Amino acid sequence: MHNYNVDRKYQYNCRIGNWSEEWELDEYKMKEYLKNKEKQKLVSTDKEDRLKRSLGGVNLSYANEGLVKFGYTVMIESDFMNAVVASNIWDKITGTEEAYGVTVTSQKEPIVRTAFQLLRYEQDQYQDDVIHYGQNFKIAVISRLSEKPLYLTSSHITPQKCAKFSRKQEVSISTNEGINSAWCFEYMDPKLRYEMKGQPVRSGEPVLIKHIPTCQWLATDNVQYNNEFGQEFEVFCNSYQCHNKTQNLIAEKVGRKTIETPMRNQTNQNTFRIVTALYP
Amino acid sequence: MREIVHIQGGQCGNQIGAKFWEVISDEHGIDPTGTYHGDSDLQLERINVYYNEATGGRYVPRAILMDLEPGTMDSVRAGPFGQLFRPDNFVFGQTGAGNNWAKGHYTEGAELIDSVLDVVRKEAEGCDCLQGFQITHSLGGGTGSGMGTLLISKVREEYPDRIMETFSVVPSPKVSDTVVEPYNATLSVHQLVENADECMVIDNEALYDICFRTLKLTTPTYGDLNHLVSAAMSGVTCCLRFPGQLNSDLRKLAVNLIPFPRLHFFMIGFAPLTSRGSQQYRALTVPELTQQMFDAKNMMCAADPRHGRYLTASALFRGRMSTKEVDEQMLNVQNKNSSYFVEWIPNNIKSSICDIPPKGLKMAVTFVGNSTAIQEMFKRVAEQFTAMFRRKAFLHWYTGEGMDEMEFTEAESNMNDLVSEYQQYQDATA
Amino acid sequence: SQTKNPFLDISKTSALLDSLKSPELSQDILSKLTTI
Amino acid sequence: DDLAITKEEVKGIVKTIRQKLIQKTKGANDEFLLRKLFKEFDISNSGFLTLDEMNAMLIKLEIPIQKRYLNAVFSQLDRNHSGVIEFEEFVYYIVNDPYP
Amino acid sequence: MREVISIHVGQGGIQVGNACWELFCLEHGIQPDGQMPSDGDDAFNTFFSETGAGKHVPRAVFLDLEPTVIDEVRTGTYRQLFHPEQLISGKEDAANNFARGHYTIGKEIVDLCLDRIRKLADNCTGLQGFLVFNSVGGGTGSGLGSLLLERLSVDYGKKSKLGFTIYPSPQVSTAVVEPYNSILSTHSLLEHTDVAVMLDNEAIYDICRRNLDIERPTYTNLNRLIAQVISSLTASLRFDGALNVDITEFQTNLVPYPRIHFMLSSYAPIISAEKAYHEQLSVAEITNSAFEPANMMAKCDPRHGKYMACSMMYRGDVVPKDVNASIATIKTKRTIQFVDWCPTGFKVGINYQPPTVVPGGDLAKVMRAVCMISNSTAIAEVFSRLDHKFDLMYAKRAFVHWYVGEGMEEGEFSEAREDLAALEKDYEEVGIET
Amino acid sequence: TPIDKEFNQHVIFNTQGVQQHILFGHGVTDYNKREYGTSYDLSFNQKIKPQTQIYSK
Ligand SMILES: Nc1nc2c(ncn2[C@@H]2O[C@H](COP(=O)(O)OP(=O)(O)OP(=O)(O)O)[C@@H](O)[C@H]2O)c(=O)[nH]1
């Protein structure tokens, strides 16, 4: 004659009514939680693992005489954006190929995911190991982040292919092995842009980046971005050239000047500075 | 290969759909990322029935969402397995239905249905040989009944060749939720009897009542009510997706579930529904199955299944089993119900054999039947309609959007005749 | 109701006619010609 | 040595087998055909192929590749040379490749 | 030098043919893969065909508008057994509608079936006949089987036809529209076939029950029993024996008048291996078992009327002398009586070959067996049972329109009932004395 | 309210969240066991005894 659903209800601890009926349903979760625990599929076991490896120990290699050379695991900082370039392997970009998004992070504590490799891109006349301006080179990811070698790459403008937030040409961390890997440094001072060709590059000096297949500068702007690793800004390639025009047409015919030496100022937001480790 | 389509709209219509796909994926084995991770061999030979094929990265569920306001849609996207639906099929208006049928079918729907008609036809022509249409909508809802039915109305004109089912949720008098439930539903029922091929209704009151009685769950949530149906509705097409001994398609149901042309209203119940009480204490055997399947409190309708006579009933048996019981079980049940089974049309029960079992169960029974009691719901709504119409209550804002009382007069006569026509056969004797 | 009677009326017209034919279709394959 | 594989022959053979699959089912499919066949036989499920399945896998869908010619394609496909291949990448070259 | 092309229409027919195919292949040593292992012999030509390469392609055609039936066969182990295109696969099923399977969607597919049958008959020159199984209470089987029944008679003409139909179960049935599709199929199939056979499911049910004590039998065992019968009729066709009977000798020994071409057959003994140890299984004793009602393979009691014809086929280690002696025993019993005008109706043949038991089967290994096919007026009630049902639910014009909308003529229903009464009496007038 | 996010995952799955746990409202000791079997898939090829079929266990 026992009645159920008797208005106000207690917790299942008391056996006032319907206690056993709710208990088993309450008890079942762990049992179901047990089997889902039997196979590695819990999210909590998923979220943390990403931080561990990504936050795995990283040691930036030393710099001798400020002469950064291919092989020394170096960081890439944004001088104006006061952040270090960070990579992600989990999140997947909307790309049929296997390329992965990138994020610039304010934290400067050294982590593997923020380390790359500068391996010689192409055999050249410069067999001596000191990197020379305009000598082709490629961004290489640390072997610890991903099993397959990963290369940062960018493609051209496209109404279909465009930056998610910046709306400019996106920078892609993919496994392609074509033209899309090359890069070449260029001195910050606009006037010196010409007579720096072939000159040594010194660690600690500001560095700009431009794409040889497309000739666009890789820089960062004050735009928010969302991912698991907290909050972060975006990375993309573009030319923030000083909007002021220069009458280059009359320069040629009159011949006072040549196209090679640039007459258009390049603002700071493109400023990057290579930095080595604090100690050897 | 003779696939059906899905067009879900309205606050009620979309909510039901959200559960069904999840149920379909689980049975058919497709993860949230849209990639297939099934086990059995036979589950990769028919995914076309309820899933398309696209670039190697996923299978696109052929879905369309229709509704007059954005809020209701915004929830479905954030729900689990919300990455499945392609954005292109996303259509949504900025005005809101407001539970006004006229606003849902005459003024606003006209300049939004053009695109939805555009998308549906595009999806419609994609198939090789379309098998039918199955629209989930709520007659008592402002956005659904008006906007939802019109989509149905156009479909009938343009494709008189395919068949159509209807899972509609009607309001029952005991549980009242919208003050305009009587009217807006009434205008709705008019356009289905002349246009709909198969109609099986679902009542909110039962779905609650089955839970606390059979399941006996203290505080079930919407997921439970929605979750049950999604599996149940997919039980209709079981023979239509995988191999089976006695293949049976809906059209077979249509021919074998409709006594007279205007008698295509259905109510359903599912078995075996077992509460967490004695799962391991009970044996699921055919004798237990047939016993529960005729339970008056297991069906998804509020009408009493013992106040009339059974015309036609069919269940697509699930799992491997021997025919003898099935023939013996019904024949055992059928003769023992001499008072509740019509006679001039003998052998009023069908059976089917599709071997594939739903996950976690060995015996599964899905039930459909045309029962004379259904009109009992019609009396309650209609009786409400006459009382609330005589004083022109709320009518003036069902007339101020461009429709006059004439059709109201036309419709109300429709139900009374429809109820009467379905009662005369109750006393019909050869 | 208007369409109820007309549909029921014609069938009964035929239905009664239909039952008429079945006794009328009775030919017993040379009933007495077996012995004749 | 009798001779060495020539690139053009590499272009034809890759082309020759390539066009062979287009003769199967519908245009919308023919990538599931390469994916679905793989799924049937892979105990590891990681995605690492070998030579035998490749000679076999070619066997199922009428791909009579010659042994010395067999070896020519595999290397060209992989710059790893580690005796393994990515199925997604391997599928990618067969169909998802704008340039010869 | 005799070959027979087998016909199977509808999913049920496909299942029965599938079930009989394993036994047929086994009884000839052909492996499932299409190559007989190295070892009257090798003369499989009776049921199969040889290119000379080793294969053995059956001379059967599978038709269906419902892909589920033949999707499995193309997915099974025997996937190499059957000719690839020889199984025409339809798109949309007839959905149990006789008109749809006969008037709307059957036409565009019928030509394909005719072409294949025409192609197959070219190889054979002494084709004994055609074998057809169809569901009278089943839509796709009725119409598709029915239409072919009309064409063959005009495609070839005098060529005989042997129909093995499965009428609806007398008391417990699945479909409800069966009374329509049965009468129409009975109306049409009547005048385009040479003889018929009774195949109600309940009879096989109880035969399996009281014999195999199988409280849970399925359709596979029913098809197994059916095939065993199918092996029976042709046994003399591909096995040496002093007494042999061919298909052409059927209208002469089982037709008193041309219209009456409906026969009921029975097979026995059906005994589990667990019960044969205490059984002698003598040829004479099995003779009795084949004549009493419970062993009949159809839900009929022969005691309700006389006997008009009865054909007995024997195969095993039997002796002719016992056959007359045991048969002489039957004539003594007064419980079985023939008609006044049928003095001789016994047709007995002897085949040395024993039945072959497929692995995993139910029937035990025995030495003697017999197949009973008798022509008796006892078929009077079966049509009447359908006759009452057909009228009850039509007089209110229930389900009427679903047929009409597909082009089926309204008056066509009137004639269908017209024939059923005519056929019932024809058996009636042949039951009175001179 | 500190409302640690870890509890939310743990609280929702134990404290009558408004959802259902993977079609367990239709459940029936350990049950995933996605079962599937047809007549010709097993019977005619595997030569499984006709009585062997069914046999719940
Ligand atoms: N005894 C027995 N009967 C079967 C079997 N398979 C099918 N049937 C018959 O099939 C009937 C059910 O309808 P179906 O035969 O499937 O319908 P159909 O003959 O295919 O006709 P369509 O509706 O056009 O597909 C039952 O009444 C059975 O008599 C079987 O394996 N054994």
Ligand SMILES: Nc1nc2c(ncn2[C@@H]2O[C@H](COP(=O)(O)OP(=O)(O)O)[C@@H](O)[C@H]2O)c(=O)[nH]1
């Ligand atoms: N059982 C059940 N009923 C619902 C659900 N959502 C809405 N309803 C019913 O729908 C009615 C109101 O529908 P309405 O809001 O007008 O639908 P809309 O027109 O699409 O916005 C209420 O009476 C509810 O009973 C649900 O998730 N489950």
Ligand SMILES: [Mg+2]
């Ligand atoms: Mg069929």
